[PDB]
């Protein structure tokens, strides 16, 4: 849902107020990815320990 | 094609062996050129020598 | 080249190590990216 | 750009399209200044 | 800039018909329709009718069959000739300029047109001069009496229109077949009895022009 | 474009298209002359 996908690209283009709003959602997105990861990883462990 | 006013043109040059119909081939087109035209497209016709 | 420097090249800007590679760039291909949206390689505008 | 383009008695050579059928899509022009129809009423020239 | 004011008509009797002449200035007249109305006889402002540009016109349906429109291309001049007036039919008339959505952006001036069947009279002018016990503070307060003149309008004016600070124009009073006009202005005292004071009275109808001395 | 003689009406509103150069933004940015000077998905003073 942010402007752009890449960080340089809206920190090259947007002021401070307005990067950290679209940083924000890909801060919670690419969060949420690798706790999935995570979250999937782990289980996946428990079934090959 | 017209994407957001910019009339995109693309092209591809090759030999072929055919003596019927469209022959049966797969080869991906490149860019050509890229015009921003802005004009709505509805027909269109081909020149013939 | 094959230096970590902070580079910028019409707008794709970012960390990398300038390197010549073995990739064969079409004249309309201006800059590569890999699947993560990250740039893999660049056309110089100055010296194409 | 009062001090420039207003002039005494008012400065009309900008105009704009009052209204229009449908809404223009993103950079869209139209210099056409034929009468188009308000209602069902069929003009074909003549305002009125 | 803009100009499209009315003249022409001075008395009219009723059921009877007349000619209006109304200069358009500031634009030309094959790139706006001149719209025709009137001015409150009575109820709400009306509407008469509208030359589009080089084309046909509309007409009021309670006038299309008397009111006509003679737009003078040529001349940069609008006519228009009524037929079967009634004395209802009393007020200013006015041309404006076709707008976007058949707006009428500009207004003119018009003229008081006047329907009776009483017959036309110069105005007999008589000032208000204040007697020589006349007493001032700081300023004085001076007019006329314009009685017995027939159409409307009359202007008063204080030395040819020169004070402007308290000028007040009254409305005519309806007397038998004339009207009574009065005025009120002000201006301070060392203008009179020092310097020279005249009312200036000018009848568009009758064209007269009265000076009398206050 | 900006000290133009005159512009055009908003709705023959000219596309002036921009290629093959270079220009200073501060400059506008900064020149202390514009009534309204508001960006929409980029920075003026970054886009330099």
Known sequence: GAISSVLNDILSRLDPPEAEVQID????????????????????????? | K?????????????????????????????????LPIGINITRFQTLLA | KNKCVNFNFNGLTGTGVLTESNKKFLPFQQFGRDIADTTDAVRDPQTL | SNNLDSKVGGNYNYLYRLFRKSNLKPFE???????????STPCNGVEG | ???????????????????????????????????????????????????????????????????????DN?????????????????????????????????????????????????????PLAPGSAAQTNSMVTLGCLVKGYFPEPVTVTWNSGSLSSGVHTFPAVLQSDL??????????????????????????????????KI | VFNATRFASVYAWNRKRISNCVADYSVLYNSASFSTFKCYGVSPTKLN
């Open chain 1, 25 to 49: 959602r890909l801060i919670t997105g690419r969060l949420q990815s690798l706790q999935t990861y995570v979250t999937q990883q782990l289980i996946r462990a428990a079934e090959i320990r």
């Open chain 2, 2 to 34: 017209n994407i957001d006013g910019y009339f995109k043109i693309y092209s591809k040059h090759t030999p072929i062996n055919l003596v019927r119909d469209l022959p049966q081939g797969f080869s991906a087109l490149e860019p050509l050129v890229d």
């Open chain 4, 29 to 39: 022009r139209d210099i056409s200044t034929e009468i188009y129809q308000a209602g």
């Open chain 5, 1 to 71: 800039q803009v100009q499209l004011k009315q003249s022409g008509p001075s008395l009219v009797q009723p059921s009877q018909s007349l000619s209006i002449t109304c200069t358009v200035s500031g634009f030309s007249l094959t790139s706006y329709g001149v719209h025709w109305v009137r001015q409150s006889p009575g109820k709400g402002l009306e509407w008469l009718g509208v030359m589009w540009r080089g084309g046909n016109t509309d007409y009021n349906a309670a006038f299309m069959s008397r009111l006509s429109i003679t737009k």
């Open chain 5, 74 to 126: 040529s001349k940069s001049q609008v006519f228009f000739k009524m037929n079967s007036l009634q004395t209802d039919d009393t007020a200013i008339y006015y041309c404006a300029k076709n707008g976007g959505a058949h707006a009428m952006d500009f207004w003119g001036q018009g003229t008081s047109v006047t329907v009776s069947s009483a017959k036309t009279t110069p105005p007999s002018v008589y």
């Open chain 5, 179 to 212: 009207y009574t006009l009065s005025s009120s202005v002000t201006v301070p005292s060392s203008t009179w009895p020092s310097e020279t004071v005249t009312c200036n009275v000018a009848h568009p109808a009758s064209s007269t022009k009265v000076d009398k």
